């Protein structure tokens, strides 16, 4: 399914090229710009563990999800992945634990050593 497709087809967007964050573009965005470090970004997303059954979405909570890019407000895979996206783009991201919650985990939602899968839609981004 979508996570295996990312394994097979995803672009490795890590600096180290360790296949820790793999991306597939599912919808091409608009324009040319991608967000800068410190930009306020606006997204919709859905996420899940690759193993077991825990699913999370911005769509429930009744609004875009906002954060400052590249400042450690979200897991490393997001800082890396969202920085690659154009406005309007949708991607799928497969995130190995080294770019997520690592050996520690974050319970109840996240076990130790968890690979995560996300669908992210970049709605907008603005310099702080």
Which residues are catalytically annotated? 45, 55-56, 75, 101, 118
Residues 125, 37: contact at Cβ < 8 Å? Answer: no
Please report how close the Cβ of residue 65 comes to ligand 37K at its closest, in angstroms.
6
Residues 38, 69: contact at Cβ < 8 Å? Answer: yes
Please report how close the Cβ of residue 121 comes to ligand 37K at its closest, in angstroms.
12
Alpha carbons 23 and 21: distance in angstroms, whole number: 7
Contacts of 109 (CB under 8 A, 6+ apart): 54, 56
The site for ligand 37K (CB under 6 A) is made up of 45, 47-49, 54-56, 67, 72-75, 78, 101, 106, 109-110, 116
Q: Which is nearer to ligand 37K, 26 or 40 (CB)?
A: 40
Q: Which is nearer to ligand 37K, 7 or 106 (CB)?
A: 106
């Amino acid at each position: 399914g979508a996570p295996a497709t990312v394994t097979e087809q995803g672009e490795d967007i890590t600096s180290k090229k360790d296949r820790g964050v793999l991306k597939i573009v599912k919808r091409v965005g608009n324009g040319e710009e991608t967000p800068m470090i410190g930009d306020k970004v606006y997204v919709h997303y859905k996420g899940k563990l690759s193993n077991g059954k825990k699913f999370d979405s911005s769509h429930d909570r009744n609004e875009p999800f906002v954060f400052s890019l590249g400042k450690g407000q979200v897991i490393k895979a997001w800082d890396i992945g969202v920085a690659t996206m154009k406005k309007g783009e949708i991607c799928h991201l497969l995130c190995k634990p080294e770019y997520a919650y690592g050996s520690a985990g974050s319970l109840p939602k996240i076990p130790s050593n968890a690979t995560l899968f996300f669908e992210i839609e970049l709605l907008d981004f603005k310099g702080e």
